[PDB]
Design a protein around this ligand. Structure first.
Ligand code: NI
Ligand code: NI
Lengths: 400, 390
């Protein structure tokens, strides 16, 4: 249906709707901010999103070669590009630590969650248009609904514990109008099935399943090289954790190649390590196919997802778990997040103490307008959510 | 009795013919807990106490030969003075107050308790018994030989031994008869201590009294006008003849501005305090010779020392620049404790995170966090605090 190319709102511009979405995302302030989030390491959320985008287009290429039946349905290069460039747009300062703080400070006003924030930025906050954010095409928006339910569908009481305040995932109720618009050309039967729970949503569109696989592959492999050279993991820990589990993961290529992959990763030469990384990436990409979703969805973008081969899934889950155990869940990273969450909570409590007086004037004006609907807190939340770590540190110093 | 020379666990190389106390001294010097005294110096203070301590032993065994066999060897009295201050946390008394408050529902915190816990359990020289020192050395570190359950500015800690260290305290006191053990446990304050520990306490007191006094005068923290009114006048009436006679000159040698003249005044004071110590029997029907005798300073000489100690605390410690530093330190320690106990597994170092997981099977995680903070230097605690809050 051409309704998937429509937007909420030149002669020589012959680009597809998806090429225009990619250009908008590339130009947005929200995208440029991912560059902020004694060595020469510069891996950011922006570089993570470029690598996901390049894996995404490679996944599409492999499916259009092995499954021609689906060549009309698969996303174009710029559509899968657009979903990977945007997937991390909504993340707050200080990663999960920022997210926990904002969610707790919004406990009585809809909460905070990064995927919801991503939806809110592209449909409203990014000022590319006056009233519809980046004003992206409907299918692009559908590809961004990793959790296509409202947070009303998906309380903790009682120094703060991370387990107690991790947000549920979904779409803010204050963005329901833009969600209703995205789901409008769906039959009622597809619409009531899309919000079905496994609370945790179960379903997503085909374009979004591809982006999720590319994101998961990027996270799994492209963090791994610099973890090795920075010394965050030794050869011994790689053998005990990753290599042994990959030798028993059940996929024949990994069981065959792990010994040689481990020697290449610890070669000490970039031109050798990249071939291990390239082979891992390629082994994972070539193991993805589109199969039908186990729900009686009627719309083709919901009736089919891309799935990775299960034994290959175990290998990917070993890699993702490994980067989480030696790159993220280390005290050096977790203290930075604790500090960030203490910082975010300070800014919120001061700024909500008197928003008109302390907010920048343009944000103060948005706060006054929003109080006609008593949604002032969400304005403070958007403002803190769009800060970089450096901007938040500077605001905190001005206040404390 | 050999039992005193024993260690909690059992090989010595055939060519090692050192006494148990020479090996205790070597372990203490090689420990990380000792090396930390350079940051906290407390190491300088402990070397001064050690060298005063052997001075006391030498002078007693010359005036009271009946006790030559009983007095501690040089390496034993060395070990107790080198180890005495191991348990002190960052920020000194302000740190001690904050930790004890954060541990109010879990056994408290106290520096002398921490010292015992480090040498019996925490220092990883052995897998299960810390530095595994000889029993008599351990007995010498028990300035307060009761449990903190018996002895428990409002938060200053009571003094004693942690209940979580009851096993190694029982082991240390095991070769004592019932009557000695029930006499040793006699805020409440303990009354008794071993001979080795009485000599060490005198050495720590003389070193605190005089060697802190020397830098305060050069550093300008005390001028002659306040020295004359507070300490010098009080020493002219303290009842010790040596101080009443020699106070006027010493006061001019102390403000000479020449290091080698000043050393003579300090040296004369220390020797004066040192020669006025003797071994007398303890006022209790103890059977064990190490508990039946203490070293005591002659009472009038004792009053002069308390004039010296009160002057060093009133003009070097109880001054606002130092006290504000202690208020900050205690806010900083409480900050760390609240972040760390908020999520230990994510915030503690992985080795310490592991000890916390193991310790909660006995619901002893709070003591692991307290151990970790107590072992920080000021620079460590300050850098950790910045990682969590600034
Ligand atoms: Ni990602
Ligand atoms: Ni001392």
């Amino acid at each position: 249906n051409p309704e998937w190319l429509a937007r909420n709102n030149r002669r020589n511009d012959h680009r597809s709707p998806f090429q225009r979405d990619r250009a908008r995302i590339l130009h947005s302030a929200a995208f440029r901010r991912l560059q902020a989030k004694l060595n020469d390491f510069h891996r950011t959320r922006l570089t993570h999103s470029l690598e996901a985008a390049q894996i995404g287009t490679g996944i599409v290429a492999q499916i259009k070669l092995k499954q021609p039946e689906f060549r009309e349905l698969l996303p174009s290069d710029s559509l899968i590009d657009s979903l990977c460039l945007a997937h991390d747009i909504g993340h707050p300062p200080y990663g999960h630590g920022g997210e926990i703080a904002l969610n707790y400070m919004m406990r009585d006003h809809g909460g905070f969650e990064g995927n919801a924030q991503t939806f809110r930025i592209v449909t409203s906050l990014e000022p590319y248009t006056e009233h519809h954010g980046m004003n992206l095409s409907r299918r692009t928006l559908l590809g961004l609904l990793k959790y296509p339910a409202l947070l009303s569908a998906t309380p903790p009481p009682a120094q703060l514990k991370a387990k107690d305040w991790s947000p549920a995932k979904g779409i803010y109720d204050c963005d329901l109008a833009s969600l209703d618009w995205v789901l409008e050309p769906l039959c009622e039967s597809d619409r009531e099935l899309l919000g079905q729970m496994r609370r945790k949503t179960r379903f997503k569109s085909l374009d979004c399943s591809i982006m999720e696989l590319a994101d998961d592959i990027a996270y799994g492999v492209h963090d791994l090289e610099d973890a090795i050279v920075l010394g965050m993991v030794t050869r011994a820990q790689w053998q005990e954790a990753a290599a042994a589990q990959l030798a028993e993961c059940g996929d024949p290529w990994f069981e065959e190649h792990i010994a040689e992959l481990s020697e290449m990763l610890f070669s000490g030469k970039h031109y050798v390590r990249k071939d291990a990384i390239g082979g891992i990436v390629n082994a994972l990409l070539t193991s993805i196919s589109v199969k039908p979703v186990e729900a009686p969805f009627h719309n083709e973008l919901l009736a089919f997802n891309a799935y990775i081969e299960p034994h290959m899934g175990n290998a990917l889950e070993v890699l993702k778990h490994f980067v989480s155990q030696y790159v993220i869940q280390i005290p050096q990273v977790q203290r930075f997040e604790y500090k960030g969450q203490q910082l975010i909570m300070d800014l919120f409590e001061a700024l909500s103490a008197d928003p008109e007086r302390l907010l920048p004037q343009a944000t103060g004006e948005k706060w006054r307008k929003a109080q006609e609907q008593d949604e002032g807190m969400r304005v403070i939340c958007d403002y803190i959510a769009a800060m970089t770590d450096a901007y938040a540190q500077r605001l905190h110093q001005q206040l404390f």
